[PDB]
Amino acid sequence: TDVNTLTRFVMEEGRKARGTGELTQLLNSLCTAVKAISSAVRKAGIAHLYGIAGSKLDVLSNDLVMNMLKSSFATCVLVSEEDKHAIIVEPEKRGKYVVCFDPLDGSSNIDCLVSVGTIFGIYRKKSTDEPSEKDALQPGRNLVAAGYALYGSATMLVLAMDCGVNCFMLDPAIGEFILVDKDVKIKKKGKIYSLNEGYARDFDPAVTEYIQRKKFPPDNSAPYGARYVGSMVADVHRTLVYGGIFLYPANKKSPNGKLRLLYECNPMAYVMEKAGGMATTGKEAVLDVIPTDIHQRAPVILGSPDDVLEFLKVYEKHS
Amino acid sequence: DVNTLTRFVMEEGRKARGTGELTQLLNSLCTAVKAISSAVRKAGIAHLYGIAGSKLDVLSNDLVMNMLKSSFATCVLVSEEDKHAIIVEPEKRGKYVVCFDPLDGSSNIDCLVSVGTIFGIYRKKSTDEPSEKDALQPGRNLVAAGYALYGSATMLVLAMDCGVNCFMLDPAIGEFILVDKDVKIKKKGKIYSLNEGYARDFDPAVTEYIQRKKFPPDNSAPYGARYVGSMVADVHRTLVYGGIFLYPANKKSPNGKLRLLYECNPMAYVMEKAGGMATTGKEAVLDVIPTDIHQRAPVILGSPDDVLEFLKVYEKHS
Amino acid sequence: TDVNTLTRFVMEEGRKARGTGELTQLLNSLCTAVKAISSAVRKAGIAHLYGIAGSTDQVKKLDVLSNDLVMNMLKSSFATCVLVSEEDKHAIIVEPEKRGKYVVCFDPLDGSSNIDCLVSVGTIFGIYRKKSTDEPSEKDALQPGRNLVAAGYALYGSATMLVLAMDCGVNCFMLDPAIGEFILVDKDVKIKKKGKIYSLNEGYARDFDPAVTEYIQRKKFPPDNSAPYGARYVGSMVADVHRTLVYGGIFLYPANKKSPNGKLRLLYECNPMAYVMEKAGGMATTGKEAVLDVIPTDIHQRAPVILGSPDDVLEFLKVYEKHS
Amino acid sequence: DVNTLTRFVMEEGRKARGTGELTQLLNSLCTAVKAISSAVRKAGIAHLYGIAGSKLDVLSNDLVMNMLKSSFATCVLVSEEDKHAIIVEPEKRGKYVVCFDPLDGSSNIDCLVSVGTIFGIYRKKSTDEPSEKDALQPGRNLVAAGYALYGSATMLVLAMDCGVNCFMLDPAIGEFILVDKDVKIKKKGKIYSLNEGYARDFDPAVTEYIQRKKFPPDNSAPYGARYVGSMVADVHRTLVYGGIFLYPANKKSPNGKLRLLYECNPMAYVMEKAGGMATTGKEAVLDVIPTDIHQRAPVILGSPDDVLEFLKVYEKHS
Ligand SMILES: CCc1cc([N+](=O)[O-])c2[nH]c(C(=O)O)c(CCC(=O)NS(=O)(=O)c3cccs3)c2c1
Ligand SMILES: CCc1cc([N+](=O)[O-])c2[nH]c(C(=O)O)c(CCC(=O)NS(=O)(=O)c3cccs3)c2c1
Ligand SMILES: CCc1cc([N+](=O)[O-])c2[nH]c(C(=O)O)c(CCC(=O)NS(=O)(=O)c3cccs3)c2c1
Ligand SMILES: CCc1cc([N+](=O)[O-])c2[nH]c(C(=O)O)c(CCC(=O)NS(=O)(=O)c3cccs3)c2c1
């Protein structure tokens, strides 16, 4: 019942645990970045560019998250969609955490104003040798914290840690993320499937037959609903809230899927498992995949357990 | 040389003679659209969840209703959220009929997916005293029509005889900034939009069209698939990037789902004033004369060439 | 009755009079600049000046950016011909493409000299009409305040409020920073006939002529054995004048030695607040004549001003009438 | 390199080890201030005037209250708006005592004058059970104090033993941005501030001192009068531009009007830390042992040389 905010949640789960403060401040700083990304995505100031005072979003998001993570004095390696190679933090500002993020996911189609988001996934540095790109190559199992911000009909940050998955709604009136769902867990089975079917020609037989099973029920029930926005963050958030399954399977145009492991697949897979769901690559679990490159693509099928398991059974049959 | 909706709306009105009522209708309407935005972005949510201690469908409809009522430019008012028509009280009557969906796609509003307002303004056909028949005009007679997208940012799209204009809201000052003038649509796209969870129930014409897209017949490249589940969001994508949108008829919806007067007709008028088309398969959406204010209709809108590619497949199976 | 926004009220009243629509157009563009000023004064985006994104239009002083906003909104309205401002020594003649009927005199950000202490500041405006038959010039701004089509201010205080005086009367609108509309909160307001506040800079006590020095003692030591008036001086005209509109009372900025002909500017401070006051049942006097009756010879002309509640202003006037 | 208050209030804590409770207090306090600013600037005023169909003292108090109880860092809470010391429920208790005025100057708020939230943080010293007594500490024992000014913009002024620090609220992101660091006051000023309507009732000492500033002794230049009527507003001017602020004993209030624990004592700590001075004419405001939570006190604060000059005149007449 009693109120609580994202700032207080992270400075109290971090308070009530050892207390180095770096991860508290990293997350602290990270929401402040997201709040700034939100106002820019809501186009708050477009009038000054169009002549109110008189005579980039994907780039600006990357700058904000980087800048802030750097100033947090808690990051040593930083991997992003935009920056090809990793970003080794200047000595002065280094901490002990490796952060992998997609600063604006879906801005390929931001000109139609579709829901976009910010995906993040925090690792701690295991190695002793001087920081490097290779420190980002940890398996998804090793995620200290992951989550995503959604810039949709409203802004929401979904934080996943060992203590569970907690969903915060940005009240733009006060500039504060408000806790509106505690320790969320996904439905066991849903009525929704999320898939780009223009690649129907190029599907695995198992993916094809699972969709046929959903479209044309094999147990004389009701067919599922198709819901594909075109931005992972939105579809996954629906898959959390409403239940169901999300699929970006391996094609032939993309033999390894399209969604990147380190900063797209793994963070969403962590959120799913920490909330009673599951995510798999078909053959191995997304979190158990060991990266060899930081921009490594991966197939990913995440969502409600009784559905992903149904998929997985069909994967047995077609392998 | 900044050009706001409120400025646009009274120069296009002055550039079209006439009283000034429609300007003040669109002013009141967009003021309500600004207040829907505020609630949809969840401003004040902390007070509900107990920052001091201790519904959107309805709120959105109340905002639109009170604003259009107070505008002195409405006689009949038709909404999703009202089974009957709203005969505006005589002291506040105007010369226009507004058919609107206050918040479209709110069924799945809890996933925080793009919702929107849809509207379409007619001019009274009445001679004496208004009635719900004034809303029962074909889409061809639409004075003005458009929508507002509460997505990545809030955009009002306004189609009129002078064309389709897109205004971005600037939340900092609450002004709609003209960012796209007289918009026209790609002649053909690589996007298709429908709910394939009804594939069991689709017409043979529909099914073949999708096979043509999933499996190009001319050995080109397969089209793309996008169904947000919200008409504003899908229509606006079909406007911006191009492509095709369908919510066709099937056996368990012989008349589609999407309503005529406050969903299909408004989006058809946008598309046709932007160079796209909009058909039910047999008539064009704007050419259906309604019999019921909550009448349902099939809709296949989008880029011109794409709807033509459909209509050829449709005629073959009929 | 029902909700109303500044936007309809302006374009409603501008249709109840047929009318060109320029005044409506002007009042809108002026409004839109006012919301813009408010958002900058509330320091929105101050974080992008302090390294939020790392590196970089508006590294401007707020009083300048305000002026630029009001200017580039007014010119673009196609309703203005001559524009007078405090931040401009000469009147701005609008280009022949965007010329209109009305002459506007304004103070973009009044009180910004102490905006460091975050004091209430505001935008004072006043709309005349070109009465001249010849091309626009700084002469056209030299009209008496009697010839005001409309006047008012926007107070950027605990909240942002636009006060609009016309022949209608005075109409108070509050900005809802959520939706970005001015909401009609008070309609056709009038001032309290008499009040219990007095407002002036008593640091200039050494240079007060006897009329002021007596009246002030009549308030601190009342003659009728009643109760002393309260002393209230923000140091920002929009602030003190607005309090005098809501609570009643009196506001004085008179003749000194340092500035013997007043300080407060006539065309874009005194005259507009006099129109507000007179249209709301109050008075505004120079001591000699009434403020609205003063005949300008220069655009940046100063003037002594004593405005406020009717009984209060007249009480002072009897005291000045003893000394002349 | 940006510095927010959520960073600063944690950095200082980490540097002093400490549980994390003074941090959470202030972090929770600031969210309350962010919410009060929203209310004061009239966000949602449209809905009170019927945009969709059809108190601030109390809301501000409820906000501070509920946020501080939720902080898990308070045991005793003292406010204007409750004639009682509020003792926090055992499950939500910390070790600090907060004496606060949630909205000061809202007396004269219909004219929209600058208002503000004043606060001061003590630490429970009695081994006893949390009670009103724990708040009756002299201001000297203060861990932290300050105020939130809701004027031109919103600023949180935060005084501690690491100096006084000013934080500007950026409504675009809801973040208090550090803009003036380790601030310090001019040793002498040119501005004076008091209600001269109470002239008939002032100390002969006060009356001389004002003469001494209105008509200078060294026939130099006079000071400038500035009385807003909101202590936060006047005091913040006196922090920035310098000068003096008085609310001395007249007769209707012969022991001052301004409340010691939650009006005078917090402002004294700010001045003190920023190199200023704050006296009752007898003793330092921080050195007044309180008897009642709502106890009033004569307050004279500002630039040190100017406060001393008043004190010189006081000693003559005393
Ligand atoms: C609910 C989990 C949680 C949440 C927050 N929070 O802020 O909500 C936290 N904040 C902080 C902080 O002190 O900054 C911590 C530190 C604890 C920690 O995880 N150490 S470790 O990297 O796994 C490690 C690497 C090698 C040996 S132990 C923390 C933990
Ligand atoms: C570009 C199209 C356009 C746009 C706007 N706008 O505001 O962007 C308009 N505003 C208004 C207004 O009246 O203010 C108009 C007049 C509309 C109207 O009168 N239609 S009619 O009753 O069938 C009729 C009466 C007499 C002859 S035709 C208008 C038109
Ligand atoms: C209630 C007072 C009031 C308020 C507003 N308002 O919008 O707050 C106005 N807006 C406009 C406009 O047309 O812009 C007007 C008319 C301006 C005008 O035409 N003056 S005139 O040539 O001597 C004349 C001809 C015919 C009648 S008066 C107007 C008037
Ligand atoms: C003034 C510097 C400063 C600022 C903040 N801050 O929040 O910016 C702090 N936060 C916390 C925390 O507990 O997290 C501390 C330590 C706890 C504490 O000060 N205990 S004390 O007996 O009152 C005491 C007074 C002096 C030495 S120790 C802290 C300290």
Ligand SMILES: O=P(O)(O)OC[C@H]1O[C@](O)(COP(=O)(O)O)[C@@H](O)[C@@H]1O
């Ligand atoms: O258009 P496709 O091939 O279905 O790709 C969809 C996927 O691409 C993405 O948009 C990748 O995001 P961006 O390329 O815009 O950064 C996913 O969010 C989304 O799930």
Ligand SMILES: O=P(O)(O)OC[C@H]1O[C@](O)(COP(=O)(O)O)[C@@H](O)[C@@H]1O
């Ligand atoms: O789930 P379905 O059957 O595909 O329906 C989706 C369609 O219905 C709508 O959601 C209509 O809005 P509501 O369902 O929220 O009333 C369209 O926006 C949308 O395109």
Ligand SMILES: O=P(O)(O)OC[C@H]1O[C@](O)(COP(=O)(O)O)[C@@H](O)[C@@H]1O
């Ligand atoms: O210094 P003084 O004599 O108090 O002058 C105060 C007057 O100067 C002004 O501040 C003039 O405005 P500026 O601060 O922009 O110069 C008036 O608003 C105000 O009433």
Ligand SMILES: O=P(O)(O)OC[C@H]1O[C@](O)(COP(=O)(O)O)[C@@H](O)[C@@H]1O
């Ligand atoms: O009417 P007065 O005596 O000048 O009172 C002014 C003083 O009273 C106060 O308003 C007391 O606070 P309140 O407004 O909450 O009663 C101070 O803020 C202010 O400095």
